[model samples]
Each structure stands twice: as C-alpha cells, then as structure tokens.
Target chain A: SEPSTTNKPIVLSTWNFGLHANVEAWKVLSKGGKALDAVEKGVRLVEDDPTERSVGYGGRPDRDGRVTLDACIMDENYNIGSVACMEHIKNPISVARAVMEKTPHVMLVGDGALEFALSQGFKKENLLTAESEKEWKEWLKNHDCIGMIALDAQGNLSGACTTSGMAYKMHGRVGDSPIIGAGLFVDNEIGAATATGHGEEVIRTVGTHLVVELMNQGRTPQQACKEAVERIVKIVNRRGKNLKDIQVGFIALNKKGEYGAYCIQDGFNFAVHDQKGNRLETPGFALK
Target chain B: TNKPIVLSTWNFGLHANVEAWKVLSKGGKALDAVEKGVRLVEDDPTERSVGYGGRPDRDGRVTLDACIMDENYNIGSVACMEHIKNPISVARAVMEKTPHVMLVGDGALEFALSQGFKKENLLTAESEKEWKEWLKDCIGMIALDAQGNLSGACTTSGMAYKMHGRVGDSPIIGAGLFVDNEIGAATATGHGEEVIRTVGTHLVVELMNQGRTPQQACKEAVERIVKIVNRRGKNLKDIQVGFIALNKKGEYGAYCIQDGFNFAVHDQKGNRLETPGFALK
Candidate 1:
C-alpha cells in the first residue's frame, strides 16, 4: 500500500522562508533534540530576523503603527502556552515556553503579557523597523506569517506558531497565531497540525485541532489537511464571501512520519526536511 | 427532532432565556436568538457582571470580553475592549464583517467604533462604588433553534480588579464556548482560569461528538478540571467551573465543580432554574 513509513526525525514549516527555518530545525533534530526544542528553536530564528516583516522585530505594525505579536508553543505532553497582543518582545516563542513552564495560566494578553515577559528576563525594544514604518506611511497595507511542526528522534510531535498579525490591523487585534486549537495542535498519540494564511477562517474551524482529529479518525496526513482546507472553502461560500481573495492553509504530520499540506489557492507552499535534506513542497488547493 | 430549546447560566439567565425564546418561538435564527438573549443581560445595569454597568479592572475601566458563534462555524470575539455598550453585538459584527475571528483590547474597541457602535462610559456609580469596595461574573448561553442549528454566546467584565490587560476564558473561543452544528454546542462560566486550563467548553462538545450524553460530557469536563486543580495542589474549594451542553437531538446536561452553581432552561416545557451535578457539596 504505502511506501514503508517515511523516515523519522522530520521537520516541516510554512512558506518559502520555511526552507531556511527547516535548515535551522534540522540542525536540532539531527543532534537528537526534542521536538519541542527543535520547533521552538526553529521559529525563534524567523522571529529574530529583521527581514521577516510579518513576524517579531521589524514586522509590519497595526493601524496605530504598533508591532504587536502573537505566538503559541505546544509540547508532546499537551502542555501549551501563549502570548497575544504583546509588544516590545522580540521572541514570543521563548515567552510562550516560559509561560508554559513558569505559570499556571495558559494564555496572557496585552500589557499583562508584556509585563510577564519582562519579568521573565525578556528585554524591551521597539519591534518596528524603519522600512516597515515607511511602508506603513505610504498607503497602509499587507500580511502572512508562519507555523512550524516537527517530529523528533524520540518520535514526539510538537508545534510552534508566531506572527505580528495582519498589518495595519486595529490597534490591539490578535489573529489565530497565538490560539492553540486555531493555529496549532499536537496529540502525541495521533499527530500534529499547524495553520497559516487567513487566521479568521482557521479560528472558525479550530483548524489545526480539526486536522489532528481527522487523522485520529484514520485519514492520512494528506487527506486530513485537504479536508481542513475544504471546510474553510465551504464556510467562505456560505458566508457569501469571495474565495478568490481569501487564503487559508494547513500542514499536518501524522505519527507515521507522513506529512502533507493544503491551502485555499496556489502560491501556498511549505518546507520539509528529512534524511533526504530540505526542499519546498507544494500543497493541494481547493480553488482553481 | 425539532424540539427547539435554549439554556443559559445563572438566575439572570431566566430573563435572558425568555428573550431568546421570543426569537426561537418565531423560528428566528439560532445566532440571532443567542445574541439577543445575551444582549439583555448586557443591558441590565443591575447585573454586575455583564455588559453595561459591569465591574471594571483595577484601573477603574470597565473592559469587556464577549464572543458568538453560529452553526456554520463562523466565530468572532472581543477581549479587553473598552467603551462598548454591547460587546456581543460587536462580536457578531466581527464575525459577519471582518475576515478575523478575534480582536483584543484597543483594536476591538477601534473596530466596534468603526462599525457605528457608540462609545460610552460603562462604569456606573453603583458599580464603581462596589468596585472601590471590592468585585466578580460571566454569562454563557447555548441554544438549539427551530431549524435545528446551534449557536452560543459568552460575555463578562471579567474578574473584579483583575490586572490591566488580563483576559479570562470569556472571549477565548474554545475555552468559554464551542459550537459544532453537526454534533452539539457547549458554554462555560465560573473561574475563567480553570475553564481555560481544560478548554472546558470545547472538550465537552467533543465528548458529545463521540456519543457521550450532554450530562456525561459536562461532568467529565468538570472532573478533568478537578483533577488538574488537585494535582496542581490548589484548593478545589477556591475554584468554580460550570458547563452546559446541548446535543443536536435536543438532549441537554450541565455540571459544575461545587454546589450553588445553577442554570436556566427554556424549552416547550417553559423556563425554569436547575442545578448541575457537582463534584463537591
């Protein structure tokens, strides 16, 4: 039936930048790192990149021109932690880890989240880049972010999602990036899934959790991800919204080491790294 | 199969359920019924935990959190929002108008203002005085309409004197409310932190999807919270978490961590107040 289960110790992430993100993550998994550490380390690289305008420092700002960020991290044990509407934090993924480790709460928002990060030894800095501010001044526009999932040497599944959110958004807007069931979900027994593209549609379906559950019900990673994308398409149609303008995507990795992805349209792709090395992989899409 | 029903948290929900019945009675949409019902509590100044005269944060501002979901799985929410009289209605607007599911703090306020909702001072002198003295509350409601569709809403001013920018489970989608039209719907109230910990409402609905009775699902959810509380070495007596679940077939169940938690129900049998199965008396 299927080619013997794909090799283990694989890492997958969203978008073109994910190629490099995978490289960094590969470094960890190759060294026998835990899935949780690999994923956290992976996204933290993107979050620290000044050129990655859709996340962390130098990212686009909200309508108020503030660079608020949202992120979440989940381990194989079902432990999850999140920070939303946080400003001045360069690596929210780390803050999310701290939240999971040091606090009893699962999520913290806005100034409270910021204060917690500061207390955790995170520094305060302006996340906005001069280039982003210049672009914001021009006409005000644009966005897309990242989610990364990994299967480590120990066969554990984990995921991390982070974003600055839709650019030019309302002053305190937070997208699905920091929401657990929405942007990322991991079930050590079943698999793990993460979402990118439009946050609203993802949140409506609790996108990633739905994907993992589909796999639990016996769908392959590919089938489960495609089904998740179709759900969003049907929702957009039912709401009388144009599917042409909206994009939502899901990337899933099952316990078998099989990984697959799907999105609403073309132009969406993900990165996969295994013993074979890193390469970009195109996902199935709902709309022509 | 078409036995339309509505359920909500607390005694004030009795009044809220009546308004919801007016809509469900006329075959109104489930979404409209839930929004109208929660708006009633939101508008009641005497209700110290929801909408207009609800208590404020430690900063003396009455920031609000609310969310609504329709049968189609379209969801929207607003948290730590200020100057809005009806956050539920705004949550609907966010669902119907924007491409996003949740908005927080000032962004939620800006979006509501942009949508024609007037800015107003939500803190009444009575609420402010009580806040100065001390604070607490939330309302969560789930409904099955004549069309057999399910919808739910949850709203609150959040914990009394909470830290600025603190958000509980009220505005978080899977935490305070979860509705799966194909399976069932569930909503939560009580210690928002405890509810958030287990993603209580969604967990209850998922259990129902797996063929658990609404009551069994709700009890299991509360039991999970109890286990987490006990393992964390926290005093269970200090925390309260309540849940109400309604399946697609019109079957309903409720559960809470301790006694004294009651809910309101409105169906063909008319409205009444009832207590859920509790882990402790």
Candidate 2:
C-alpha cells in the first residue's frame, strides 16, 4: 500500500552498501530537504568514513593500493554529472555536483575531476592510507569502479556514479560507473536507475539509462531490471560464454513511490528509506 | 587445403580442456564431459579466472557461475551464486534433478552445498586484489562439442565487489551458454549488460544458422546491438562477447571482439588447442 503523503517530501532510496549514511540521507530528505542535497550529504558521510572499504576514502584500493573514489550526481531537471577512475580525492559526489552546477560538462575524469575538486576549495590531501595504499599497490595490478546517485521529483531528475576501477589493472583503466546512462540514469517522468557490476557489461548494456527508458515504456521497475539483465544474457549466450560468470545488478525508483531491484547474482543487499524516516533493508533477490 | 580450423572469440582454460578431453576421449556422455570440464575450473583456486578464490566481490567474497547445454539445445544455468564450489555440477544437477531449466542466487548455492558441494572461502589474494581495484566481473558458459555428443561449460567469480549484490549475464543460460544440435553451440564473456541486451552468444548461433560464418556471425550480432541502441552511456565496442561452436560435421568455430579469448578444442585427430586470442590460428 502507498503511504500517506504529507507536506513532507517522500524520500525513497536504495543503496548497495552500508546502511547508516543512506538512512541519514533519507531522514534529511523526508524532512523537506532536496533529494540532491540529501544524496550528496549521505554519500559524503560514506566518503568521510574510513571503515567502509567498498566506498569513499578508505574503501577498495587501486592496483597501486591507493584509495580512489568515484561518484555521480544528477539534478531534478534531468541534468547529470559524474566522475570516474579517480584517485587521491575524497567526496567525489560533491565535485560531480559542481560539474553539473558550475560547468557546462556532464562529466570529469582522472586529473580533470581532481583539478576541478581542487578548484572548488577542496583540500589537496593525500587520500591514500596505509591500508588503502596496500590495496592500491596490489590493485595497480587491477582496474577501477563506478559510483552513481540519482534524484527524481517535479519533472527534474539527475544521477551520478564513481569508482576506483578494476584491481590489478593498468593505471588508467576505467569502468562503466562514471559514464552516464551506463551506470546511472534519471528521468522525472519515469524514474531513476543506478547500476553496479562488471563496468564493461554495464557500459555495453548502457545499464542504468536503458532500464529507465524501459520504465518509460510502461515496464515496472522489476520488469525493467529483468529485461536489462536478460539483455546481458542474450549477448553472453550469443558469444558462446557462460551466463553464470559475468554479473550485473540494478536499483530503480519510479515516480509512483515504487522501487524495484534485480541482480544477476543470487542475493544482493540494498537499503531503502521512506518518506517517514523509516528504513528497510533487503539482502538479495531470491525467487522461491 | 590450408584452411585453418578457426575457433575465435572464445575463452578457455587449461583445466577446462583437461577434464573435457578426458571425458570425450573416454566416450563419456557430452553432458558428463561438459560438467567434468567446468568442475575442474570451479575446483581449482589458482585459475584466478573462474570459480572460487580468483576474482571476488569488493567485500572479498567468492561468487561462482556456470552453464550447461545439451544436444537438444535445452540449457541450464546459474550466476552470482555463493557458497558452492562447483556451480556447473549444480547446473547439471538442475538439468538432471529438477523440472526447471534454471535456478539462481542463494537457493541455487544452498541446493548445491546441501548436495555435498563443499563451501570454503571463495576469496583469494588475486581476487582480493580484483576487489580492491573495484573489478566486479563474473563469468560462466558451456556448450556441446562437435561430436554431436560433446558438451561445454564456462564459469567465473564475477566482477569484484558490486553494488546491490549485482549478478551479470554469466549465470543466465542464453547469455552465457547455449547449444543447438542442428547448428552449433556457443558461450560469451565481456560486459554482462550489453551481452544480456544482445542475447549475444545465442544470436551468433542464429546468425550462423542464417549461413554466416562463425566470425561473421559474432561480429554482426555485436554490431547490430551496438549500432541500433543508445546503450545508456556505454561504448558499444567496450562490450566483449565470445563464442565456441561445433558444426553438424564436427568442424569447430569460435569468435570474439577483444583479445585474450581462450578456448580448448578437441578436433577429429584427437588433438587439442589450449590457445588465447580473438581467433585461434
């Protein structure tokens, strides 16, 4: 059943990682704050925390074992911004927002994004730590990742994503996260989608944006997610590869306060916060 | 006739062929051969490309994937699954044990583990490095060999740690594995999203049915998907898909977009090629 709508803004969000910051963002937005603001604040919290190794400062290290950050931000007006394959910079989401607000560009990458961050008065501190450095030194042997955020309301929507990239990859390897529509998508009329998985697959499928377009065509969030995954399946099959290996997952939210999520994997973890400051968590998608 | 037997645009490992050839040469059933071949990759921790302890999630957990196809072209598959060592065996078990064609996620893993598949730390130092680098790619696929009696299998631990516990095209049957006795069999790799959208591996087989060579079929299928769609925000060329096939006459073919497409082929002379490249020379 749909919850009662009050003067308060209904905040609904789904996240794959830690619950604390996302929950906080939900609370802030439910109290009449803007969706973009709430997302930025929430993600900023994750960036600040050193323990959350999957994201922000202390998160997964690069091939050089340095903590790299990636993020994206989109506004309600359908404008989008993102950062990818970044390093030694924290709070990538904030810089992504600035690109949308302060620059004509929709994305900034590598040193450009970092330079933009520095231009915005962001501190130029060495973002790598001993632990993350170790991971990076190991990962210089790998690749990078993507991160994203989306907002939907009042015919306006925006989204963003970021990542450190593949582990043990060459220094400049970039995945799908920072690519708009590939990793994140927003359409005020339909909804928003954000993806995390094999960046190449997401890039190939144009994941988040494709799902949003599917939703526009009257597909439900769940159906859109399934279709997106099925699209990947078709390609893999045609290639004579195994479907069980390459994995991708998505989280989508529609204009009707409805949300749907799907993953190629057996189970995934996501958290949702509603308009009334309530938090709900689903670990993975399982069919009985 | 210097025409080389081409099997391009595919992925293969030493362990995979060791088992498949062992069974095929021994006159084992194609399904059994496929299962044994995939199980070898799934069981080895050092392969670093498939099964456990290779590439892991950002959280450093090992996830596994696998697929199997039979002579009739009926397929079974699984992906983004955890706690099970040999997903291919479970995929075969689904074919043999259940009425359904596929099962996914924890249920699939639980079923496999319950059936005596030992569960251990799927993560390894290599996978941990993958995770740290934010690489969350998963893998799996299987096909029947040209003997009209042989089968194939594929698998991977998935991309590194991902958001929303994302699973990719690997586990789904058509995405990662497909078999059609009338035409051939095929599998895939690369970006799961694009692969999923294109129905790539199977599409290549369909294209081959339309009289296109395996290489032509692979290229056309990928091109069709990439050219027509906006593809969210991804580059069409960034997505990779590979295929392995055995024609009606037992002649084999394979193809892929990027380099490092590996496969093991057992030909009429009982010879095997454990080679890596978009095209096997």
Candidate 3:
C-alpha cells in the first residue's frame, strides 16, 4: 500500500561510458553542481581532450583515419537531444543540448548536424589531424563510434557514454551507444545504467534501460544486471551460438548509491567515488 | 628459438600463459604449446585483459572465453564461462582430456576446476582502467614450428565497459585464431562480435591456403569483412589483423591489415627480431 522506502531522492549522480571520465563527472556532481551542468562540463572535459582516444574532438580515426564524433543528452523532463555519426564538430554534446533546447527535433545526423552546428556558431576546421587522418584512412577500412548523456531525477542523476565503435568497424555502423535505453538509461525513481561493448547486442537486448527497469521491479543491481546478461546469452544460445564470439557489459547505480556491473566477456574495470569523494577501483571480478 | 609460439582466438590470462609457456618449454607438443600459452593469459590476474576483475560486465562481474588449436588440427574452446579466472586452461584441458571440442557457460568453468585449476579473482586495476577507457578488445596468437607446423589460441576480456557476463570472439578459435599447415596462422583483434560474424582469423588463413601471400591474405581477410559486413565507410578498412607463419622451408613471414603489427621471432641466426610488420628487425 505504501511506496518502498528505497524510493529516495538521489543526491547527485553521473555515469560516463568511460571510467576515468565517469569518475571525473561524479566528482563534479559531488561538489554541489547541477546534474546537467556536471554532465555538460564532464563531457566537455573529454571533448576538449584530443588525446582521449575515446571521446570528442581528435579521436582515433575511422578506417579512413578521420576523427568523427557522435553524442546525445537527455534530462529528467524528457527533453532529449542527440547527434549521430558526425564529423569535425567540437563539443558534440553542446550541439546535442542545442538540439534539445533550441530545436524541436530529437536527433540529427552527419552533415545536417554539422550544418546546424555551424548555424549555431560552431567553427569549421579540419577535425582530422595527420594522425587522426591516418587513423581514419586506416579506418576507411572500418566503422565509427557513438556517444550519449542522460540527466534524470530531482537534480539527482546524470550519465554519459562515448565510443569509437569497433576499431575497424565498417564505416557508419551505428551501434547502441547513442540509442536511449540501449547505450544508457536512467530513472529518478530507480537507478541508472550505462553500457559499452557490442552495440548491436545491447540494442538487441535493450540492455541499459532494462537493467533499471529490473531494479525498479525490486531486483538488486547485481540481480538486474545478471538477468539482463542472461537474456542476451539466451538469445545467443537460441541461435545455436556461443558466448565466446559475442559479448556485452553494463554498469548500474541504484537509488541508494549502491552499484553493480557485469560483462559477458572475461571482465571489466570500474571506479566508484562515494559521497565522501573516496575512489575505489575493481580491476577485475572478485577473483577467488 | 627461446620464444614460445602463442596462438589464441579470444580468451587469455596470466595463468594460462604460464601453463602454455611451461608446456612448450618442457617439450610438450605443438598443440600443448598452443593450449598452455593461452591458459596463462586467461588465468593470470596481472593480465587484466583476460581474466577476472580485469574487465567488468554491465553488472560488473567477469565473464571469460578462450580457444586453442594444434597443427594436427585438434581444437578446444570455451565461451561464456563465468566467475572463472582462466577459461583458456579449461579449453586446454578440454583439448587434452576430453573428447569434446568446446564448452560454454558454467559447464566450461566446471570442467576447468575439475582439471585441477583453482578459481580466483580475474580483475585488476589496469584492466579496469582499460575497460573504463572502453577498450573491450580481444587478443589471439599463433606459433609456427620449424617443420612449418602451426598452432593458435585466442582470449578476450570482451567488449570494454559492457554489461554483466558479455562474451565475444576471443574464445572462438576460427573467428579469433586459425592455423593450417598448408598455409599459415592468423589472429584477430577489434570488435569481437563483428569478427565472429565474419569468422575473421580463419578467413584470413584460408585465403593464405588458397595461395594468397601473407600481406595479401591479411588485407583480403580484413577487407572482405569491411566491405561485406561493416560497409560503414572507407574508415572501417582501417581495422587491423595480424598473421604469421613458417613456409615449407621453415622460413617465417608475418603481415597485418594495419601498417604495423608487433611481433618477435627467434631465427636460425640466433637473433631475435622484435619487428613491426614483415621485415626482420
């Protein structure tokens, strides 16, 4: 008859697809910043750092060795914005914000996103360096990556994920990283989840958001994650397939700030900074 | 050569590597060499890329995969093995002790423990960092004997920063590592799911068997996948795969889809060449 006591307001939360950036974002949130501002600033940190091969600005090139970027952002109010498979645009999340706040659209792709960025005063520059160009040239032989950010709660939770996709994936092979509830998902009333790994598998399972929904249904973070993985595994098995060849992983944070993560593969690395700003890393699984 | 030949398709660990090296160094067969090398990388906690705690699933636990094959064409593999630090060792044991060629999920780990291996935490800080950086790539290796015989293995930490219990191509031998005495051996890296879909390493080695040169085989294998399945852009072509082999005369050659591939070889001259690509250093 009464709502569960677990339904408490999350103080401040953020998840980055990357552990390092996620830790940084968490720190920003812990310091009394707005969830949206923390997501924007933290993502901007990655976007500004050209050396961060996984984030915005100069990233590892596609088969053609050119640096392209994709990013998305969503707020608790259900306002969502995204950029898909874009090239040469700096601050992609900002452009994503522009889409959410300035335009009526929820998504934009490639040249169109660039055109919008330019109209919004984004500069046109060679987003590709010799190295990135070379990487792109190398990738011309592969695909690209995607990114996403989400802010949910009563000023409580936010998250983001970014990827170069498969290092040599076919060009324009969009995985689930930018897709809401696939690459990332959050609920102010439950928990949040962000995923990385095989984008297709995540999409196939609707993994990110599913984990949170499971939690909302009263499953522990660990239980929700395990069930989501089992779902994917079942798909692989029913196809008369095996897990060694296909894999996925996720990170989830519950409303109480407890966290759980799992990978279909051997393992993953994660870091946690509590309310006290103490950071701890689980390098591998709980090895016996 | 003092260096042991290593082959892998997907899974890896330090314990597995130690086992493989020990077996090879102790005069075990080529197949043994392939099996043990992979086991070490799979089981060793320090590898951070292969076994527990090294990478996490979406739920933050470790899942593992591995495969091994000998020049005799005997193969063994495991996939979706959970809560285990060394999936490759189980793969090796499956090859040595079982009539089966592969095992998956909990069964694989059960078999591994039955073979006298202990379970342990597979995660490490370095691996966690790697996962956090979204580096969920896999590794594979192949070794060629003086007789032109070849063996291979593969291991993976799977896709980086993934959900719980994700697995990928690293433990799928044909997709990750493949060997044929008639041709050479090959290994794969990058998106394991896509690589599995394309049966990457085997495709490359098959091309070599069909008379393609090492470089040609490497390019063709990756190119085929990019063109056929990936088809995203010219950029997908940039993905890299590596191949190595001993010809009929015990002469070794290596190639990669990228411009460079790191390799070490001990030659008749008693010298070690840690070269990138085909040329001897």
Report how far off residue A123 is in candidate 1 (Å).
2.6
lDDT of 3 by residue, B1-281 (tens): 22344433323322344455455555566665665555555555666567655566544556776777666555666665666666666677776786445555445666777778787766577655665566445546566543446677777666555533334556545556666555577767665545543455655665666577656676665555545433333354444444544333344445544554454443333324343343112
lDDT of 1 by residue, A1-288 (tens): 643665679999999999998989998999999999999989989999999999888889987789999999988867788899999999999998898888766777888789889999999998889898899888553237779999998888999999999888877778888988788988777899999877777877778877887897799998999987887787788778899988888899987789999989898889999988898999878998
Error of 3 at A133 (Å): 3.1
Candidate 1 stretches greater than 4 Å from native: A1-8, A140-143, B52-61, B116-137, B206-242, B256-260, B278-281
What would the DockQ be for model 3?
0.01
Q: What local lDDT does model 1 show for residue A110?
A: 86
Identify the leading candidate in terms of lDDT: 1
Candidate 2 deviant stretches above 4 angstroms: A1-18, A135-157, A283-288, B1-281
Ranking by DockQ: 1, 2, 3
Q: TM-scores of all models?
A: 0.88, 0.48, 0.45
Q: Which candidate number would show the highest DockQ if scored against the true structure?
A: 1
**Model 2 Cα lDDT, one tens digit per residue, A1-288:** 533632223333435453565665655565656677776776677677665565667666544454455566766645556555456677778877886677644544455567677788887766666776766565455112333233423323444455554444433334556555666766665677878767656754557766876787688877888788877776667657676667677777776656667877665545555544445455343232
**Looking at model 1 chain B, which ten-residue stretch has the lowest summed lDDT?**
B191-200
